[PDB]
């Protein structure tokens, strides 16, 4: 479980208003800690976790300046992209970026990334070597040539290997009481009506952190992902998460099935079954 710092940028054009909106969020692991929204009056980078509030005005000023610049660059970019794709001004289009760093066990960059999408499809991405780009279509090759000409990749690599990692370590210290403590799931099995073919068993995992978890159903030593409904992991609202897995089983045969829960807050996987 290597820690990570990641930023998620979304820019959307608004032809009815003749403008665009830019939204940025930052995460450490699965915990959001900052946001920026170009639609806010006098928009600033804003704290979204308690442990980041100890940063002084120099931090918030410098973060605000960078996000204001990025917001303007992405607005102008939406117009360039509309040109590249032969699109009219009637519709709304979406430009996204995500980037971040994972911290290796030696304190060095384990994996850095920076990628971009247009209308929800991969556009251009920094390669694993942090030195070159891969472009998805002919429009993206325009950007790629411009970014090669300007030696952008070298500047991204310096960020990902340097400031990104350094700030991650600092954040991890600042919020160590919450970011560095795993909360195990509280678990239980419920039973519900289904149809003629049997009863539903639902295995719950509640209030865990971080988000990564495995819920599996088994019958007599054999996986049941075949017929099981597995919901997307969802936020509790307090910074922890929830998930469940359900399976229709023959009436009277509930005890032949076990739910198995792997989470890094547990010393060993939990095994549970309907009482």
């Amino acid at each position: 479980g290597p820690h990570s710092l990641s930023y998620f940028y979304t820019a959307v054009s608004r032809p009815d208003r003749g403008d665009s909106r830019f939204i940025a969020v930052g995460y450490v692991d699965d915990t959001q800690f900052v946001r920026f929204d170009s639609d806010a009056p006098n928009p600033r980078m804003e704290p979204r976790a308690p442990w980041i509030q100890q940063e002084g005005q120099d931090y918030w000023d410098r973060e605000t300046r960078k996000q204001r610049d990025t917001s303007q660059t992405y607005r102008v970019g939406l117009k360039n992209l509309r040109g590249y794709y032969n699109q009219s001004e009637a519709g709304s289009h979406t430009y996204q970026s995500m980037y971040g760093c994972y911290l290796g066990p030696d304190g060095l960059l384990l994996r850095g990334y920076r990628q971009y999408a247009y209308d929800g499809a991969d556009y251009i991405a920094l390669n694993e070597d942090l030195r070159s780009w891969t472009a998805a279509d002919t429009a993206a090759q325009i950007t790629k040539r411009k970014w090669e000409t300007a030696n952008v990749a070298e500047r991204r690599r310096s960020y990902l290997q340097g400031l990104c990692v350094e700030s991650l370590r600092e954040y991890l210290e600042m919020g160590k009481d919450t970011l560095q403590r795993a909360e195990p799931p509280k678990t239980h099995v419920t039973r519900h009506p289904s149809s003629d073919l049997g009863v539903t068993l639902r295995c719950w995992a509640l209030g865990f952190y971080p988000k990564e978890i495995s819920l599996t159903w088994q019958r007599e030593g054999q996986d049941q992902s075949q017929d099981m409904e597995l919901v997307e992991t969802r936020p509790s609202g307090d910074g922890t998460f929830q998930k469940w897995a359900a399976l229709v089983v023959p009436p009277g045969e509930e005890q032949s099935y076990t739910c198995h829960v792997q989470h890094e807050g547990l010393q060993e996987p939990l095994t549970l079954r309907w009482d």
Binding site: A24, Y116, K146, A150, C164
Partner: peptide
Amino acid sequence: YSSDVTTLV
């Protein structure tokens, strides 16, 4: 800290 590298598409 967010990236200062912002380049026009």
